[PDB]
Amino acid sequence: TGRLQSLQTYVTQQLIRAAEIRASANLAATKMSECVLGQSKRVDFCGKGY
Amino acid sequence: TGRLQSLQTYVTQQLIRAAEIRASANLAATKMSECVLGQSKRVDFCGKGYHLMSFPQSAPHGVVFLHVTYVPAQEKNFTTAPAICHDGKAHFPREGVFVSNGTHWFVTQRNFYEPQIITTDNTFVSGNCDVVIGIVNNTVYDPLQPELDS
Amino acid sequence: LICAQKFNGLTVLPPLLTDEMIAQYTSALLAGTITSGWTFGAGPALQIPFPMQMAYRFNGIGVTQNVLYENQKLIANQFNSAIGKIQDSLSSTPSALGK
Amino acid sequence: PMQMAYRFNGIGVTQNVLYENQKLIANQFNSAIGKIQDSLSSTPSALGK
Amino acid sequence: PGTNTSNQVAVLYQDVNCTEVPVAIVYSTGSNVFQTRAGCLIGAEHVNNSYECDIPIGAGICASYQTSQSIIAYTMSLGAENSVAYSNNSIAIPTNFTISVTTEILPVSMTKTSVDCTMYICGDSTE
């Protein structure tokens, strides 16, 4: 019972961390596709300034 | 105790899945509001390539977008030069890049070959002709003075 | 993490992509960004020089291109010095990769 | 037609292209729609997501 | 591979030295034993050409089913090589276009589920 509880705790924490890393990866993908492959008129996205 | 444990396990998993579906729904909402209701200058967002518009379709627990994109196909070579000197003064193209096929020079837009003759309406001047590399001697026809004899 | 965890069921499946292939992808992206422009992200690519790429990029912030050609030498020196500054700051930073 | 004529103004090609190639563009768009219809009609697993 | 195509299966031992799989080991015979950083692969011959990935394995080794009829493993092909002739006095411009159309699929909502706690945990017992 105790070791099981430890397992679900660890799995839950890993799931959450996977969620944050997925969000960060999506943000990075958008950064790559909007900065590198072009020029983004947005500010504070492709660096500071024009 | 055991069945309870199963309950909070299932509830936690459902909560997480709700989080991912929330993120996906927000992304879809932004896609709908930025593609369909307008035209998005971003790339890799409203389809692959220069985007034109969209069309939504409903589906069980989801939506389907038909991005309509514009993609150039065939390619052609030309000889380029980023400036032109005519009478000791530099010239720069208004909204094209100076290309040529060898004997006559032309200015064109940058996504479809469409040459025109270069006149004052197509160029603007800045300084003299000892400032930058790539200068190519050329002549620019004047569409204003030679026409009026009287 | 050395061997105790590897000897209690805990395994570490290797990543699908090796470092060399990722480096090859980054090299490809750099090659496209340098010799092609933004075209290669939308199908077939176009070859086009570098100075007359920034000459068009400056058209995208609000300054006409004649600035670039009139300050080519200074801008080249500035960009090279900027790259060198990145190299040295990365070379002499204790904790810049917390993220 | 004078909506696409303005939309092409939004990628970097002036509208006179579209009015000079209206017929071809119409045929291409219709064929594209047909291609979507047939590819959707004859795909086993395209809705995994 | 798909049961429709065939029935030939191959086994993979995770991070077990192919030089020590004799300790580990109809498929235990040595027919075509390949070594990857992901482990020891038994039941598939090795091929040297380049193809797109169909079933990932590890360390870039991708396996596929191609015909007499057996399973192959190979180095994953990043793609066809291409080069572009950079030069400072040339320009390459398109002269014809193509209106393509592509489909994007987004989930929106899942099935609105509800659960009865007491019924599911106790049925119809007062105790």
Ligand SMILES: *[C@@H]1O[C@H](CO)[C@@H](O[C@@H]2O[C@H](CO)[C@@H](O)[C@H](O)[C@H]2NC(C)=O)[C@H](O)[C@H]1NC(C)=O
């Ligand atoms: C480069 O293009 C120009 C523009 O068409 C060509 O100049 C004309 O070419 C046609 C046919 O070759 C002639 O009938 C005209 O007399 C040319 N001059 C003008 C002012 O129209 C030129 O020939 C092309 N050069 C090459 C090498 O293809």
Ligand SMILES: *[C@@H]1O[C@H](CO)[C@@H](O)[C@H](O)[C@H]1NC(C)=O
């Ligand atoms: C275009 O010119 C380049 C040289 O600048 C050459 O390598 C290439 O083959 C040409 N493209 C053709 C002939 O289609």
Ligand SMILES: *[C@@H]1O[C@H](CO)[C@@H](O)[C@H](O)[C@H]1NC(C)=O
């Ligand atoms: C362009 O013509 C001028 C004529 O005054 C000459 O001085 C200059 O050297 C020429 N530049 C060339 C041919 O690149």
Ligand SMILES: *[C@@H]1O[C@H](CO)[C@@H](O)[C@H](O)[C@H]1NC(C)=O
């Ligand atoms: C696998 O066997 C080789 C035999 O040459 C040996 O050098 C290597 O250390 C072994 N790897 C292990 C035991 O992880």
Ligand SMILES: *[C@@H]1O[C@H](CO)[C@@H](O)[C@H](O)[C@H]1NC(C)=O
């Ligand atoms: C594949 O390459 C290896 C590397 O030397 C070689 O030993 C083997 O014979 C090759 N198999 C072929 C060409 O079928």
Ligand SMILES: *[C@@H]1O[C@H](CO)[C@@H](O)[C@H](O)[C@H]1NC(C)=O
């Ligand atoms: C770049 O342009 C210069 C013009 O000054 C020329 O001398 C050089 O050969 C060019 N580089 C090439 C063609 O690779």
Ligand SMILES: *[C@@H]1O[C@H](CO)[C@@H](O)[C@H](O)[C@H]1NC(C)=O
């Ligand atoms: C452009 O592509 C269309 C598509 O088939 C074709 O009908 C037309 O002839 C092409 N124009 C050219 C190659 O100049």
